[PDB]
PDB file of N, CA and C in Angstrom:
ATOM      1  N   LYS A  86     -15.393 -41.446 -29.367  1.00 49.57           N
ATOM      2  CA  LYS A  86     -14.053 -40.814 -29.422  1.00 49.57           C
ATOM      3  C   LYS A  86     -14.111 -39.345 -29.890  1.00 49.57           C
ATOM      4  N   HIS A  87     -14.181 -38.485 -28.887  1.00 47.12           N
ATOM      5  CA  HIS A  87     -14.438 -37.040 -29.044  1.00 47.12           C
ATOM      6  C   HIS A  87     -13.650 -36.247 -27.992  1.00 47.12           C
ATOM      7  N   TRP A  88     -13.328 -35.020 -28.369  1.00 46.27           N
ATOM      8  CA  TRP A  88     -12.500 -34.115 -27.545  1.00 46.27           C
ATOM      9  C   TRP A  88     -13.256 -32.940 -26.918  1.00 46.27           C
ATOM     10  N   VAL A  89     -12.879 -32.707 -25.666  1.00 41.90           N
ATOM     11  CA  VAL A  89     -13.132 -31.436 -24.964  1.00 41.90           C
ATOM     12  C   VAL A  89     -12.197 -30.320 -25.455  1.00 41.90           C
ATOM     13  N   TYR A  90     -12.837 -29.206 -25.758  1.00 40.80           N
ATOM     14  CA  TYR A  90     -12.184 -27.914 -26.025  1.00 40.80           C
ATOM     15  C   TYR A  90     -12.730 -26.853 -25.068  1.00 40.80           C
ATOM     16  N   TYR A  91     -11.823 -25.952 -24.699  1.00 38.79           N
ATOM     17  CA  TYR A  91     -12.088 -24.921 -23.676  1.00 38.79           C
ATOM     18  C   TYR A  91     -12.063 -23.464 -24.160  1.00 38.79           C
TER      19      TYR A  91
ATOM     20  N   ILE B  37     -22.021 -36.623 -40.045  1.00 41.37           N
ATOM     21  CA  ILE B  37     -22.174 -35.469 -39.126  1.00 41.37           C
ATOM     22  C   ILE B  37     -21.020 -34.457 -39.271  1.00 41.37           C
ATOM     23  N   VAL B  38     -21.245 -33.565 -40.238  1.00 41.24           N
ATOM     24  CA  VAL B  38     -20.274 -32.517 -40.637  1.00 41.24           C
ATOM     25  C   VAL B  38     -20.585 -31.203 -39.937  1.00 41.24           C
ATOM     26  N   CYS B  39     -20.144 -31.140 -38.682  1.00 42.33           N
ATOM     27  CA  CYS B  39     -20.285 -29.935 -37.864  1.00 42.33           C
ATOM     28  C   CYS B  39     -18.925 -29.620 -37.211  1.00 42.33           C
ATOM     29  N   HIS B  40     -18.947 -29.228 -35.949  1.00 44.43           N
ATOM     30  CA  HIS B  40     -17.773 -28.873 -35.143  1.00 44.43           C
ATOM     31  C   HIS B  40     -17.092 -30.103 -34.520  1.00 44.43           C
ATOM     32  N   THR B  41     -16.735 -31.015 -35.419  1.00 42.07           N
ATOM     33  CA  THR B  41     -16.224 -32.342 -35.049  1.00 42.07           C
ATOM     34  C   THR B  41     -14.840 -32.270 -34.442  1.00 42.07           C
ATOM     35  N   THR B  42     -14.892 -32.762 -33.218  1.00 44.30           N
ATOM     36  CA  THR B  42     -13.670 -33.021 -32.429  1.00 44.30           C
ATOM     37  C   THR B  42     -13.250 -34.495 -32.408  1.00 44.30           C
ATOM     38  N   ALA B  43     -13.870 -35.314 -33.267  1.00 45.46           N
ATOM     39  CA  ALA B  43     -13.475 -36.725 -33.450  1.00 45.46           C
ATOM     40  C   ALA B  43     -12.283 -36.781 -34.415  1.00 45.46           C
ATOM     41  N   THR B  44     -11.130 -36.627 -33.765  1.00 46.57           N
ATOM     42  CA  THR B  44      -9.772 -36.525 -34.371  1.00 46.57           C
ATOM     43  C   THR B  44      -9.666 -35.287 -35.277  1.00 46.57           C
ATOM     44  N   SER B  45     -10.209 -34.187 -34.765  1.00 47.99           N
ATOM     45  CA  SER B  45     -10.302 -32.902 -35.494  1.00 47.99           C
ATOM     46  C   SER B  45     -10.400 -31.703 -34.527  1.00 47.99           C
ATOM     47  N   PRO B  46      -9.581 -30.661 -34.701  1.00 47.96           N
ATOM     48  CA  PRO B  46      -9.725 -29.414 -33.921  1.00 47.96           C
ATOM     49  C   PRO B  46     -10.918 -28.565 -34.397  1.00 47.96           C
ATOM     50  N   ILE B  47     -12.091 -28.961 -33.894  1.00 49.22           N
ATOM     51  CA  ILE B  47     -13.405 -28.293 -34.097  1.00 49.22           C
ATOM     52  C   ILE B  47     -13.655 -28.073 -35.618  1.00 49.22           C
ATOM     53  N   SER B  48     -13.446 -29.154 -36.369  1.00 49.17           N
ATOM     54  CA  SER B  48     -13.362 -29.118 -37.839  1.00 49.17           C
ATOM     55  C   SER B  48     -14.550 -29.876 -38.448  1.00 49.17           C
ATOM     56  N   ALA B  49     -15.029 -29.353 -39.572  1.00 51.81           N
ATOM     57  CA  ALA B  49     -16.116 -29.973 -40.352  1.00 51.81           C
ATOM     58  C   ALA B  49     -15.711 -31.299 -41.038  1.00 51.81           C
ATOM     59  N   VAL B  50     -15.772 -32.328 -40.197  1.00 56.66           N
ATOM     60  CA  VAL B  50     -15.489 -33.746 -40.514  1.00 56.66           C
ATOM     61  C   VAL B  50     -16.726 -34.589 -40.157  1.00 56.66           C
ATOM     62  N   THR B  51     -17.169 -35.380 -41.129  1.00 59.86           N
ATOM     63  CA  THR B  51     -18.184 -36.432 -40.921  1.00 59.86           C
ATOM     64  C   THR B  51     -17.589 -37.564 -40.090  1.00 59.86           C
ATOM     65  N   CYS B  52     -17.831 -37.451 -38.779  1.00 57.54           N
ATOM     66  CA  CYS B  52     -17.269 -38.333 -37.735  1.00 57.54           C
ATOM     67  C   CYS B  52     -17.651 -39.820 -37.840  1.00 57.54           C
ATOM     68  N   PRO B  53     -16.665 -40.693 -38.065  1.00 56.60           N
ATOM     69  CA  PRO B  53     -16.847 -42.144 -37.892  1.00 56.60           C
ATOM     70  C   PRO B  53     -17.264 -42.547 -36.465  1.00 56.60           C
ATOM     71  N   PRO B  54     -16.784 -41.898 -35.383  1.00 56.39           N
ATOM     72  CA  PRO B  54     -17.399 -42.091 -34.048  1.00 56.39           C
ATOM     73  C   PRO B  54     -18.631 -41.197 -33.874  1.00 56.39           C
ATOM     74  N   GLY B  55     -19.792 -41.848 -33.863  1.00 54.66           N
ATOM     75  CA  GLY B  55     -21.035 -41.240 -33.350  1.00 54.66           C
ATOM     76  C   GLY B  55     -22.231 -41.433 -34.285  1.00 54.66           C
ATOM     77  N   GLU B  56     -23.312 -40.781 -33.876  1.00 52.73           N
ATOM     78  CA  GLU B  56     -24.630 -40.905 -34.545  1.00 52.73           C
ATOM     79  C   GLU B  56     -25.159 -39.560 -35.107  1.00 52.73           C
ATOM     80  N   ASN B  57     -26.456 -39.550 -35.400  1.00 54.92           N
ATOM     81  CA  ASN B  57     -27.255 -38.564 -36.184  1.00 54.92           C
ATOM     82  C   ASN B  57     -27.441 -37.118 -35.649  1.00 54.92           C
ATOM     83  N   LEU B  58     -26.645 -36.743 -34.655  1.00 54.92           N
ATOM     84  CA  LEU B  58     -26.601 -35.385 -34.070  1.00 54.92           C
ATOM     85  C   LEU B  58     -25.181 -34.829 -34.002  1.00 54.92           C
ATOM     86  N   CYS B  59     -25.210 -33.523 -34.151  1.00 53.69           N
ATOM     87  CA  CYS B  59     -24.126 -32.583 -33.851  1.00 53.69           C
ATOM     88  C   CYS B  59     -24.347 -32.005 -32.448  1.00 53.69           C
ATOM     89  N   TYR B  60     -23.375 -32.357 -31.611  1.00 52.11           N
ATOM     90  CA  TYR B  60     -23.073 -31.868 -30.243  1.00 52.11           C
ATOM     91  C   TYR B  60     -23.559 -30.563 -29.582  1.00 52.11           C
ATOM     92  N   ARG B  61     -22.852 -29.457 -29.820  1.00 53.30           N
ATOM     93  CA  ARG B  61     -22.376 -28.504 -28.775  1.00 53.30           C
ATOM     94  C   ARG B  61     -22.807 -28.850 -27.340  1.00 53.30           C
ATOM     95  N   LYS B  62     -22.036 -29.756 -26.734  1.00 53.58           N
ATOM     96  CA  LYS B  62     -22.251 -30.169 -25.332  1.00 53.58           C
ATOM     97  C   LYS B  62     -21.361 -29.310 -24.420  1.00 53.58           C
ATOM     98  N   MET B  63     -21.963 -28.200 -24.001  1.00 53.97           N
ATOM     99  CA  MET B  63     -21.312 -27.169 -23.189  1.00 53.97           C
ATOM    100  C   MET B  63     -21.943 -27.043 -21.793  1.00 53.97           C
ATOM    101  N   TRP B  64     -21.040 -26.854 -20.846  1.00 54.96           N
ATOM    102  CA  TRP B  64     -21.308 -26.528 -19.441  1.00 54.96           C
ATOM    103  C   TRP B  64     -20.169 -25.614 -18.946  1.00 54.96           C
ATOM    104  N   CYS B  65     -19.921 -25.569 -17.641  1.00 54.59           N
ATOM    105  CA  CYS B  65     -18.900 -24.705 -16.997  1.00 54.59           C
ATOM    106  C   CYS B  65     -17.716 -24.289 -17.899  1.00 54.59           C
ATOM    107  N   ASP B  66     -17.452 -23.025 -18.247  1.00 57.46           N
ATOM    108  CA  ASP B  66     -17.868 -21.706 -17.716  1.00 57.46           C
ATOM    109  C   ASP B  66     -17.146 -21.470 -16.383  1.00 57.46           C
ATOM    110  N   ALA B  67     -15.957 -20.902 -16.558  1.00 56.81           N
ATOM    111  CA  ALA B  67     -14.858 -20.870 -15.564  1.00 56.81           C
ATOM    112  C   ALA B  67     -14.354 -22.268 -15.135  1.00 56.81           C
ATOM    113  N   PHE B  68     -14.660 -23.290 -15.948  1.00 54.46           N
ATOM    114  CA  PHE B  68     -14.825 -24.711 -15.548  1.00 54.46           C
ATOM    115  C   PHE B  68     -15.168 -24.865 -14.059  1.00 54.46           C
ATOM    116  N   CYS B  69     -16.081 -23.963 -13.745  1.00 57.79           N
ATOM    117  CA  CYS B  69     -16.531 -23.530 -12.423  1.00 57.79           C
ATOM    118  C   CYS B  69     -15.569 -23.657 -11.230  1.00 57.79           C
ATOM    119  N   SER B  70     -14.394 -23.096 -11.494  1.00 57.79           N
ATOM    120  CA  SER B  70     -13.207 -23.084 -10.618  1.00 57.79           C
ATOM    121  C   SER B  70     -12.153 -22.069 -11.113  1.00 57.79           C
ATOM    122  N   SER B  71     -11.221 -22.501 -11.960  1.00 58.28           N
ATOM    123  CA  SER B  71     -10.029 -21.723 -12.384  1.00 58.28           C
ATOM    124  C   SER B  71      -9.909 -21.458 -13.901  1.00 58.28           C
ATOM    125  N   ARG B  72     -11.051 -21.097 -14.487  1.00 60.26           N
ATOM    126  CA  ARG B  72     -11.239 -20.519 -15.844  1.00 60.26           C
ATOM    127  C   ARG B  72     -11.023 -21.370 -17.097  1.00 60.26           C
ATOM    128  N   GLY B  73     -12.174 -21.798 -17.626  1.00 59.46           N
ATOM    129  CA  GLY B  73     -12.289 -22.501 -18.934  1.00 59.46           C
ATOM    130  C   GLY B  73     -13.748 -22.781 -19.323  1.00 59.46           C
ATOM    131  N   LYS B  74     -13.957 -23.117 -20.589  1.00 62.98           N
ATOM    132  CA  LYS B  74     -15.292 -23.475 -21.127  1.00 62.98           C
ATOM    133  C   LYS B  74     -15.353 -24.930 -21.617  1.00 62.98           C
ATOM    134  N   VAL B  75     -15.817 -25.823 -20.737  1.00 62.62           N
ATOM    135  CA  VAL B  75     -15.956 -27.267 -21.019  1.00 62.62           C
ATOM    136  C   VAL B  75     -17.044 -27.480 -22.081  1.00 62.62           C
ATOM    137  N   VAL B  76     -16.540 -27.575 -23.297  1.00 63.63           N
ATOM    138  CA  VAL B  76     -17.338 -27.943 -24.474  1.00 63.63           C
ATOM    139  C   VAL B  76     -16.754 -29.237 -25.047  1.00 63.63           C
ATOM    140  N   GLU B  77     -17.522 -30.291 -24.825  1.00 63.89           N
ATOM    141  CA  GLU B  77     -17.288 -31.624 -25.391  1.00 63.89           C
ATOM    142  C   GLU B  77     -18.065 -31.702 -26.706  1.00 63.89           C
ATOM    143  N   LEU B  78     -17.331 -31.970 -27.781  1.00 66.64           N
ATOM    144  CA  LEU B  78     -17.987 -32.092 -29.089  1.00 66.64           C
ATOM    145  C   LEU B  78     -18.148 -33.547 -29.558  1.00 66.64           C
ATOM    146  N   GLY B  79     -19.236 -34.102 -29.020  1.00 65.25           N
ATOM    147  CA  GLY B  79     -19.631 -35.514 -29.152  1.00 65.25           C
ATOM    148  C   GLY B  79     -20.742 -35.751 -30.189  1.00 65.25           C
ATOM    149  N   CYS B  80     -20.399 -36.576 -31.174  1.00 66.73           N
ATOM    150  CA  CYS B  80     -21.368 -37.003 -32.220  1.00 66.73           C
ATOM    151  C   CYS B  80     -22.404 -37.948 -31.601  1.00 66.73           C
ATOM    152  N   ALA B  81     -23.622 -37.431 -31.550  1.00 68.90           N
ATOM    153  CA  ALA B  81     -24.681 -37.866 -30.618  1.00 68.90           C
ATOM    154  C   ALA B  81     -25.892 -38.527 -31.302  1.00 68.90           C
ATOM    155  N   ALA B  82     -26.566 -39.402 -30.551  1.00 71.20           N
ATOM    156  CA  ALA B  82     -27.827 -40.048 -30.993  1.00 71.20           C
ATOM    157  C   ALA B  82     -29.130 -39.238 -30.758  1.00 71.20           C
ATOM    158  N   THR B  83     -29.304 -38.743 -29.529  1.00 68.33           N
ATOM    159  CA  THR B  83     -30.470 -37.926 -29.132  1.00 68.33           C
ATOM    160  C   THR B  83     -30.054 -37.042 -27.951  1.00 68.33           C
ATOM    161  N   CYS B  84     -30.661 -35.856 -27.909  1.00 67.58           N
ATOM    162  CA  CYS B  84     -30.615 -34.963 -26.728  1.00 67.58           C
ATOM    163  C   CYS B  84     -32.003 -35.005 -26.043  1.00 67.58           C
ATOM    164  N   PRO B  85     -32.141 -35.820 -24.983  1.00 68.73           N
ATOM    165  CA  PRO B  85     -33.408 -35.934 -24.245  1.00 68.73           C
ATOM    166  C   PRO B  85     -33.668 -34.706 -23.361  1.00 68.73           C
ATOM    167  N   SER B  86     -34.944 -34.516 -23.039  1.00 70.19           N
ATOM    168  CA  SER B  86     -35.378 -33.501 -22.055  1.00 70.19           C
ATOM    169  C   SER B  86     -34.826 -33.748 -20.645  1.00 70.19           C
ATOM    170  N   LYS B  87     -34.774 -35.037 -20.339  1.00 68.94           N
ATOM    171  CA  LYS B  87     -34.242 -35.586 -19.071  1.00 68.94           C
ATOM    172  C   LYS B  87     -32.788 -36.029 -19.303  1.00 68.94           C
ATOM    173  N   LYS B  88     -31.922 -35.026 -19.195  1.00 71.14           N
ATOM    174  CA  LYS B  88     -30.476 -35.151 -19.458  1.00 71.14           C
ATOM    175  C   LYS B  88     -29.656 -34.689 -18.238  1.00 71.14           C
ATOM    176  N   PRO B  89     -28.376 -35.051 -18.136  1.00 71.48           N
ATOM    177  CA  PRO B  89     -27.413 -34.317 -17.281  1.00 71.48           C
ATOM    178  C   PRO B  89     -27.388 -32.871 -17.809  1.00 71.48           C
ATOM    179  N   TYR B  90     -27.963 -31.969 -17.018  1.00 72.85           N
ATOM    180  CA  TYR B  90     -28.343 -30.608 -17.483  1.00 72.85           C
ATOM    181  C   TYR B  90     -27.183 -29.697 -17.899  1.00 72.85           C
ATOM    182  N   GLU B  91     -26.879 -29.844 -19.180  1.00 73.99           N
ATOM    183  CA  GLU B  91     -25.871 -29.052 -19.894  1.00 73.99           C
ATOM    184  C   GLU B  91     -26.535 -28.405 -21.124  1.00 73.99           C
ATOM    185  N   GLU B  92     -25.942 -27.293 -21.541  1.00 73.08           N
ATOM    186  CA  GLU B  92     -26.398 -26.526 -22.714  1.00 73.08           C
ATOM    187  C   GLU B  92     -25.888 -27.212 -23.980  1.00 73.08           C
ATOM    188  N   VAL B  93     -26.826 -27.991 -24.501  1.00 73.11           N
ATOM    189  CA  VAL B  93     -26.604 -28.856 -25.673  1.00 73.11           C
ATOM    190  C   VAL B  93     -27.340 -28.327 -26.921  1.00 73.11           C
ATOM    191  N   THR B  94     -26.532 -27.864 -27.868  1.00 75.61           N
ATOM    192  CA  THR B  94     -26.999 -27.533 -29.219  1.00 75.61           C
ATOM    193  C   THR B  94     -26.805 -28.774 -30.089  1.00 75.61           C
ATOM    194  N   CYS B  95     -27.894 -29.527 -30.034  1.00 78.27           N
ATOM    195  CA  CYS B  95     -28.055 -30.825 -30.679  1.00 78.27           C
ATOM    196  C   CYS B  95     -28.763 -30.642 -32.027  1.00 78.27           C
ATOM    197  N   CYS B  96     -27.874 -30.432 -32.980  1.00 79.91           N
ATOM    198  CA  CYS B  96     -28.179 -30.069 -34.376  1.00 79.91           C
ATOM    199  C   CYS B  96     -28.039 -31.308 -35.272  1.00 79.91           C
ATOM    200  N   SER B  97     -28.517 -31.195 -36.506  1.00 79.99           N
ATOM    201  CA  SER B  97     -28.437 -32.294 -37.489  1.00 79.99           C
ATOM    202  C   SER B  97     -27.050 -32.402 -38.131  1.00 79.99           C
ATOM    203  N   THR B  98     -26.745 -31.458 -39.020  1.00 78.41           N
ATOM    204  CA  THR B  98     -25.482 -31.366 -39.780  1.00 78.41           C
ATOM    205  C   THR B  98     -25.295 -29.972 -40.427  1.00 78.41           C
ATOM    206  N   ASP B  99     -24.127 -29.793 -41.045  1.00 76.14           N
ATOM    207  CA  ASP B  99     -23.646 -28.597 -41.769  1.00 76.14           C
ATOM    208  C   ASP B  99     -23.291 -27.415 -40.850  1.00 76.14           C
ATOM    209  N   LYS B 100     -22.123 -27.604 -40.245  1.00 75.00           N
ATOM    210  CA  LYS B 100     -21.468 -26.724 -39.250  1.00 75.00           C
ATOM    211  C   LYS B 100     -22.313 -26.502 -37.980  1.00 75.00           C
ATOM    212  N   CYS B 101     -23.337 -25.663 -38.097  1.00 75.71           N
ATOM    213  CA  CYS B 101     -24.385 -25.382 -37.087  1.00 75.71           C
ATOM    214  C   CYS B 101     -23.979 -24.890 -35.681  1.00 75.71           C
ATOM    215  N   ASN B 102     -23.269 -25.716 -34.919  1.00 76.82           N
ATOM    216  CA  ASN B 102     -23.169 -25.660 -33.438  1.00 76.82           C
ATOM    217  C   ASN B 102     -21.713 -25.546 -32.904  1.00 76.82           C
ATOM    218  N   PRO B 103     -21.157 -24.329 -32.813  1.00 78.21           N
ATOM    219  CA  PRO B 103     -19.755 -24.153 -32.381  1.00 78.21           C
ATOM    220  C   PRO B 103     -19.547 -24.142 -30.859  1.00 78.21           C
ATOM    221  N   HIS B 104     -18.366 -24.612 -30.477  1.00 83.03           N
ATOM    222  CA  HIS B 104     -17.778 -24.534 -29.110  1.00 83.03           C
ATOM    223  C   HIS B 104     -18.367 -23.486 -28.112  1.00 83.03           C
ATOM    224  N   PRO B 105     -18.219 -22.171 -28.337  1.00 82.57           N
ATOM    225  CA  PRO B 105     -18.427 -21.117 -27.316  1.00 82.57           C
ATOM    226  C   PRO B 105     -19.875 -20.981 -26.843  1.00 82.57           C
ATOM    227  N   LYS B 106     -20.068 -20.014 -25.952  1.00 81.22           N
ATOM    228  CA  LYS B 106     -21.408 -19.625 -25.510  1.00 81.22           C
ATOM    229  C   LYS B 106     -22.212 -18.979 -26.649  1.00 81.22           C
ATOM    230  N   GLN B 107     -23.121 -19.789 -27.177  1.00 79.19           N
ATOM    231  CA  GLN B 107     -24.078 -19.356 -28.223  1.00 79.19           C
ATOM    232  C   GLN B 107     -25.064 -18.301 -27.681  1.00 79.19           C
ATOM    233  N   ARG B 108     -24.503 -17.109 -27.550  1.00 80.05           N
ATOM    234  CA  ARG B 108     -25.143 -15.950 -26.902  1.00 80.05           C
ATOM    235  C   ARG B 108     -25.623 -14.899 -27.913  1.00 80.05           C
ATOM    236  N   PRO B 109     -26.897 -14.499 -27.826  1.00 78.83           N
ATOM    237  CA  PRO B 109     -27.487 -13.446 -28.674  1.00 78.83           C
ATOM    238  C   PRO B 109     -26.770 -12.110 -28.427  1.00 78.83           C
ATOM    239  N   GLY B 110     -26.507 -11.397 -29.519  1.00 78.33           N
ATOM    240  CA  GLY B 110     -25.787 -10.100 -29.503  1.00 78.33           C
ATOM    241  C   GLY B 110     -26.599  -8.982 -28.813  1.00 78.33           C
TER     242      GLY B 110
END
């Protein structure tokens, strides 16, 4: 459970 | 794993309950190779193998280390 950041 | 944790954190120094003994910087595209963005997935990781889906992975131990952007020499 981890997020993409741009 | 107290680095650039995106496990319920905006790129924040949190020891992630989701994941293992590595700090991420799992980065690739880079214009998201279409209409502009930098796909950096910050995944608390077990190992970064030589034989990987070829992305620029700063697979660090702990203590901040490995941020989102292009880790580019000045």
